[PDB]
Design an enzyme around this catalytic site. Structure first.
Site, short mmCIF file in Angstrom:
data_model
loop_
_atom_site.label_atom_id
_atom_site.label_comp_id
_atom_site.label_asym_id
_atom_site.label_seq_id
_atom_site.Cartn_x
_atom_site.Cartn_y
_atom_site.Cartn_z
N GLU A 1 17.58 12.18 17.45
CA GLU A 1 16.75 10.94 18.40
C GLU A 1 16.65 10.17 16.45
O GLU A 1 16.41 10.21 15.54
CB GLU A 1 15.30 11.28 18.01
CG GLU A 1 14.11 10.40 18.62
CD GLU A 1 12.61 10.62 19.15
OE1 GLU A 1 11.82 11.74 18.53
OE2 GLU A 1 12.53 9.97 20.11
N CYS B 1 -6.98 -3.35 -9.27
CA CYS B 1 -5.80 -4.75 -9.34
C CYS B 1 -5.36 -5.54 -7.56
O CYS B 1 -5.52 -6.24 -7.73
CB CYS B 1 -4.77 -3.81 -10.01
SG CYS B 1 -3.78 -2.89 -9.67
N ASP C 1 1.24 6.68 0.19
CA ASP C 1 0.72 4.88 1.06
C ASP C 1 0.02 4.84 0.10
O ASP C 1 -1.01 4.91 -0.32
CB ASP C 1 1.14 4.70 1.90
CG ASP C 1 -0.04 3.37 2.12
OD1 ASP C 1 1.05 2.81 1.28
OD2 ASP C 1 -0.03 3.49 3.49
N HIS D 1 13.00 -3.34 5.04
CA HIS D 1 11.27 -4.42 5.40
C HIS D 1 11.00 -5.59 6.08
O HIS D 1 11.92 -6.93 5.32
CB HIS D 1 10.45 -4.09 4.18
CG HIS D 1 9.15 -3.95 4.39
ND1 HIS D 1 8.22 -4.66 4.80
CD2 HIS D 1 7.99 -2.78 4.49
CE1 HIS D 1 7.06 -4.42 5.03
NE2 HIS D 1 7.07 -3.37 4.81
N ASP E 1 5.32 11.16 3.43
CA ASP E 1 4.89 9.94 3.24
C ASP E 1 3.70 8.99 2.34
O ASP E 1 2.79 10.13 2.44
CB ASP E 1 4.43 9.03 4.80
CG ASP E 1 4.60 7.22 4.28
OD1 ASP E 1 3.90 6.77 3.24
OD2 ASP E 1 4.84 7.08 5.59
ZN LIG Z 1 -1.89 -3.36 -8.38
#
Ligand SMILES: [Zn+2]
Length: 380
Positions: free
Chosen positions: A41, A118, A108, A314, A106
């Site tokens: 698929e 940050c 993330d 992306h 995955d």
């Molecule tokens: Zn950062």
């Protein structure tokens, strides 16, 4: 990077840069088993977010064709099914089954938002990316040493993180339960948002945890105490005090006020915590809670899970979902990763070797070495 040049860049990329050969080499797995690629698929997301799945192809040519024809913004890879996905309409209810698929992870950055200072959400920077580096090393070590998985392809997600494709023959046949168990084995950070303390260690430390901690140790000072400065002020260090027993709060609070940087304060935390143990593994629970990977079980559990294809583009950063050389993992930089506009730029400044002339080449090389070991395993 400009997302409006994108539909034009896709045309060119999908025609003269996307490494269809290595792609088919990968997903066809040396033809040993018939209809393997033919039962795969795929899903495409086209312009205006038009989503279609149960896409399958006869061979590499059919793929080159339909991809160049559609010029999709997103490409996702799925399972190998009982029948051809194309024909799923023709299959009786109960017989259309996902049968095999790579074991996938995955990672993330967004999942670290409760322990990095940050950035937040989809923002990344050089100061927080070290988290991926620890994640790749921590997990890949477990996949290689503890589980004996030999063919592991790490890929940049394009923006916020990294994927891992585990493609060993025995792995692709793993049940959802075993996959879920592999995720439970790898997982230490448990909880949502109601829970402030997400890591609890037993008196006895399992080797996976030890070896993960030792990897984190190598990075912790520069990542957490210098760049992130997790003990800069009270607002930040209270979050750490929330992870330790109340009976040491006041002592630490004063030692933190009298100190000047996070290294001093961490060193104080270590001594008080260590003293707390005699009459438990607070330091490691804090390091783990602040540096250990968070894993979504749903991503790795389901055999029918559709994950972003390597060498996708992306839609916003324009970056290529590029493979990561495990040997140079500490040197990997998501900010020097080729964009599509850059590799089309390079292309329009000079047949089967055009991409070698682009900055895309070394990543395709990593992919090729990944394929070579895959052949050798099939042979002997
Ligand atoms: Zn950062």
């Amino acid at each position: 990077f400009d997302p409006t040049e994108l539909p034009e860049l896709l045309k060119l990329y999908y025609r003269r840069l996307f490494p269809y050969s290595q792609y088919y080499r990968w997903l066809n797995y040396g033809g040993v088993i018939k209809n393997y690629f033919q039962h795969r698929e795929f899903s495409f997301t086209l312009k205006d977010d038009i989503y279609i799945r149960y896409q399958s192809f006869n061979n590499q040519s059919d793929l080159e064709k339909e991809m160049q024809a559609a010029n999709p913004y997103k490409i996702d890879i799925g399972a190998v099914y009982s029948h051809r996905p194309n024909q799923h309409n023709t299959v009786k209810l109960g017989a259309f089954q996902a049968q095999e698929k790579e074991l996938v992870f995955d990672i993330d950055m967004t999942d670290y938002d409760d322990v990095r200072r940050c950035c937040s959400s989809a923002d990344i920077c050089p100061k927080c990316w070290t988290l991926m580096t620890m994640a790749i090393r921590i997990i890949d070590r477990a996949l290689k040493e503890d589980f004996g998985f030999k063919h592991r392809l790490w890929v940049y997600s394009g923006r916020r993180g990294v994927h891992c494709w585990v493609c060993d023959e025995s792995v692709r046949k793993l049940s959802s339960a075993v996959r879920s168990g592999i995720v439970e084995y790898l997982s230490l950070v448990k909880g949502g948002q109601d829970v402030k303390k997400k890591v609890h260690l037993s008196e006895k430390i399992h080797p996976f945890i030890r070896k993960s901690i030792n990897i984190i140790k190598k990075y912790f000072e520069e990542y957490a105490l210098v760049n992130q400065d997790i003990l800069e002020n009270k607002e930040s260090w209270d979050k750490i005090l929330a992870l330790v027993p109340e009976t040491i709060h006041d002592e630490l609070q004063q030692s933190f006020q009298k100190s000047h940087n996070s290294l001093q304060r961490w060193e104080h935390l270590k001594k008080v915590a260590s003293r707390y143990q005699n009459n438990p593994w607070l330091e490691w629970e804090i390091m783990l809670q602040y540096c250990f990977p968070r894993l979504d079980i749903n991503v790795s559990k389901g055999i029918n899970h559709l994950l972003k294809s390597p060498f996708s583009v992306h839609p916003k950063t324009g970056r290529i979902s590029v493979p990561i050389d495990l040997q140079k993992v500490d040197q990997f930089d998501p900010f020097t990763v080729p964009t599509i506009s850059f590799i089309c730029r390079e292309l329009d400044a000079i047949r089967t070797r055009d991409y070698k002339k682009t900055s895309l080449a070394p990543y395709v090389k990593v992919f090729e070495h990944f394929l070579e070991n895959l052949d050798k395993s099939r042979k002997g």
